[PDB]
Amino acid sequence: MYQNMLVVIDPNQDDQPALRRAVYLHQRIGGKIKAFLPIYDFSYEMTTLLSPDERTAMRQGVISQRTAWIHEQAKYYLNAGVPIEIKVVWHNRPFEAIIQEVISGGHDLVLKMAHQHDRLEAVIFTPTDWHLLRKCPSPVWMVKDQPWPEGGKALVAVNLASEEPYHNALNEKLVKETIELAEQVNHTEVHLVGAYPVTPIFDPSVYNDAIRGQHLLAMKALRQKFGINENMTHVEKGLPEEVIPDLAEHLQAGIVVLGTVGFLGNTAEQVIDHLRCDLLVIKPDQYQTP
Amino acid sequence: MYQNMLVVIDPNQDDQPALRRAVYLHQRIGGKIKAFLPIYDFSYEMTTLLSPDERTAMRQGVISQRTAWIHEQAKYYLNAGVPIEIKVVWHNRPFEAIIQEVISGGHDLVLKMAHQHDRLEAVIFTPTDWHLLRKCPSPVWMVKDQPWPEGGKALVAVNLASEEPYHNALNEKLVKETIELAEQVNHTEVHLVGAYPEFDPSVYNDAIRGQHLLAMKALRQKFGINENMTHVEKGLPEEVIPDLAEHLQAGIVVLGTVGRFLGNTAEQVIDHLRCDLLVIKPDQYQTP
Ligand SMILES: CCCCCCCCCCCC(=O)CC(=O)O
Ligand SMILES: CCCCCCCCCCCC(=O)CC(=O)O
């Protein structure tokens, strides 16, 4: 139950909110913590300049000092007694190194930091962030560099819509892995959100209350196995890429759980891009990464 | 020579800065314009139950609705006589649909819109923007939704540092395709930037920088540019290029990338910039 965390280190700043969040989690749930950082310098392939002696001496010469850096930035935690393993890998293509360390390693979680400049604008993602969000097999927890709202709320977005049988397991996993988590922190404020589209321009009006006929019910099929009753479940219409973020904001939600199976969701990509809170994509298992 | 433009329509707002820029270009360079927009609706995803017929009907009604919508936003350009071609394709994964239309129609340039709130802040890119920036065989012009700097300035970033001759071919492609274009549009000023990063480092630094001044002076005088507009700095390009670009009054920056997708080396350069972007594939570059 989330007890082997992989923390992605940002080499461009000193504060690592991913690490801090990992520690906060460790204080409530426990597990391992691995400060990971793929590093690289352009100096290593200019072969016309440095023979292998100089270039590899410098290759290890970066790794050592940046490992020292991560130590100097995890020092208070280490001295306080937090079991943090530090590992700096020499790698081009960062996201690749991260995913490989996830698979070889044995990880429950990946915690990376995302930026937010202004209070009510969306969080800023990098290509690396996106690669992880669609290729990383482990549940990815994107942690924004902004403090958690004092009213803690977890939000679960469900693909209620499609009657397909692989979206059902993912739903129940999303909820279950959220309930086993919220209980263990806590707060334990778990909301359930569905989003369905009403088709606007044979009578169209039947399709509408049919779409909603399934949605209200399917949403509630989750709930009575999972005991989340009506008060914090939401079924609204409009576009998911707008329905769930503003909802998350009016709700004062600090995190949202997302599910993707397989670009991987332009339906969900647009959802992510206009988000202003923490993100937890749980790719369901039973999936293999390229 | 960019005379068959593909304009990506943002379906979440009404103003299309990509279209506006495309027209602006059309007035000085000429060519065609194709207003493109990939769309998809969840109803088509509902296998049950809409009988295949009405599902195609609602498909047709969404396509029709967006054709009317895009028509209604370019009419001031259309009635005035701008050859704007509208084509709405039905696709769930937009970047795929865009690249397919690029290769199928053979387009010279793709103009898409990126947001920027604030000055001295970075530009915001979408997943679609990133797929296009690394898989689109044609030059991609990301146009921010902010007015062009009143002092027009163009900047070209080259991988001078690493010696291999296809990065050289790509370099001069960048250069030629930037000046021959600025020349025909607004006579803007095209700058060129390099970035550079027994035991003894002190020799290594001045060996690399000795190299950069080499290659920069090798490039510049084939293109008849002045040393007054060549710049070579040390530090990381992902930090070097934006500070210069803002200090230089740059409105756009031309980038050179080869697939084997785009390295993190330049990806970081892209995420941190605050002006228009023009990514150029070496050609031919083959999209999967
Ligand atoms: C589905 C997620 C349910 C658990 C949410 C985790 C709560 C995190 C609280 C963060 C508190 C902080 O602001 C960190 C700190 O003070 O160092
Ligand atoms: C490499 C590209 C260099 C060519 C310069 C392009 C100039 C475009 C300036 C846009 C002028 C406007 O401000 C008109 C508008 O509102 O779109």
Author numbering:
A (entry chain A): 3 to 203, 212 to 272, 280 to 307
B (entry chain B): 3 to 199, 211 to 273, 280 to 307
Authors' description from the paper:
The universal stress proteins (USP) family member UspE is a tandem-type USP that consists of two Usp domains. The UspE expression levels of the Escherichia coli (E. coli) become elevated in response to oxidative stress and DNA damaging agents, including exposure to mitomycin C, cadmium, and hydrogen peroxide. UspA, UspC, and UspD belong to class I; UspF and UspG belong to class II; two Usp domains of UspE belong to class II and IV based on the sequence and structural analysis. USPs might be associated with several functions, such as cadmium binding, ATPase activity, and an intermediate in lipid A biosynthesis.
Specifically, it presents the three-dimensional X-ray crystal structure of the recombinantly produced UspE from E. coli at 3.2 Å resolution. UspE exists as a monomer, and the structure reveals a compact and 2-fold symmetric dimer in the crystal. The crystal structure shows that UspE is folded into a fan-shaped structure similar to that of the tandem-type Usp protein USP from P. mirabilis. UspE is composed of ten β-stranded mixed β-sheet and nine α-helices. More importantly, we found an unambiguous stick-like electron density in the hydrophobic pocket of E. coli UspE throughout the refinement process. In addition, the stick-like electron densities were very similar to a 3-hydroxymyristoyl group of Uridine-5′-diphosphate-3-O-(R-3-hydroxymyristoyl)-N-acetyl-D-glucosamine. The characteristic hydrophobic environment in the pocket indicates that UspE can bind unidentified ligand with a 3-hydroxymyristoyl group in the cavity. This pocket was surrounded by hydrophobic residues in β6, β9, β10, and α6. However, the ATP binding motif of UspE was disordered in the crystal, due to the intrinsic flexibility of these regions. Our structural analysis indicates that E. coli has two putative binding sites (Site I: His117, His 119; Site II: His193, His244).
